[PDB]
Amino acid sequence: AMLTLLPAVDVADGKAVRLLQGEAGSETDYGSPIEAARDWVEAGAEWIHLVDLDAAFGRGSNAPLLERIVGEVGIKVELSGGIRDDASLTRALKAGAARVNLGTAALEDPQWTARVIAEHGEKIAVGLDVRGTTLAARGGDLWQTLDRLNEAGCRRYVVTDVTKDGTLTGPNTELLRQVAARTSAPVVASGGISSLEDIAALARLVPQGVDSAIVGKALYNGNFTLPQALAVAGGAAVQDVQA
């Protein structure tokens, strides 16, 4: 199957925002999150990657708003931010999320994380937020953590190069290849996409196990439309898709 795009909707203070290099305080406001989500559905998305940034930073929450989005869209939603314990996981699943992402919990509560993975299977992914080879917590050695999560049976990873996130500098394809080689679980690419050629380059990683990509800033910045990105992810030529 082609590279799956997950257009992002990140929520802070009730707004759809993008951060630069994952830094709290660096938000650019792009308006209503439910409007953004509706736009992605109307563009032909199969998935949305929906993040509660306030919860991710351990500094408040937008949970009802995210629940409304998950319930209203008829497509699959990957939900992230603040999923750290049974109450929050239960809530995310009850909301109708197709997948959740664990982040800080995978580092701080390895026992709980392994239990969750064993119980919920393909509904669970782990987000690995990488700076060099060190994990960041919105956190340990990347490779040791990855081996532990593989042993626990993790079914999917979301790999973000935090240094590239929001920067429009291109994805860290080397890191993606390195992580994909280290696991039999599929990898979702995140951070740095800037161009239709970046999407084409990621689409050539699907055979290595990078089967998906989250797209944030490039869409909100108007670099390309979501239909353009989907076209390239599904094999259209960049030179044709370019406006």
Q: What is the CATH number of the domain that holds 133?
A: 3.20.20.70
- The DSSP bridge partners found for residue 15 are 12
Resolution in A: 1.0
Structural domain span for residue 110: 1-243
| CA-closest candidate to residue 51, choices 99, 108, 109, 118 | 99
- The DSSP bridge partners found for residue 77 are 48
Q: What is the Cα 216 distance to its own chain's centre?
A: 9
Technique employed here was X-ray
- The DSSP bridge partners found for residue 6 are 214
Between CA 105 and CA 97 the distance in angstroms is 18
- Report the amino acid identity of residue 45: A
Alpha helix (H) ranges present in 83-216?
86-94, 104-108, 110-120, 142-151, 173-181, 196-203
Q: What is the Cα 98 distance to its own chain's centre?
A: 13
Indicate which residues carry an active-site annotation. Answer: 10, 129
Q: How far is CA 207 from CA 3, 20, 195, 210, in A?
A: 10, 30, 21, 7
For the chain, after which residues does the C atom lie more than 2.5 Å from the next written residue's N, i.e. where is it broken?
138
User: Domain count of the chain?
Assistant: 1
Q: Which helix (H) or strand (E) holds 37?
A: helix 33-42
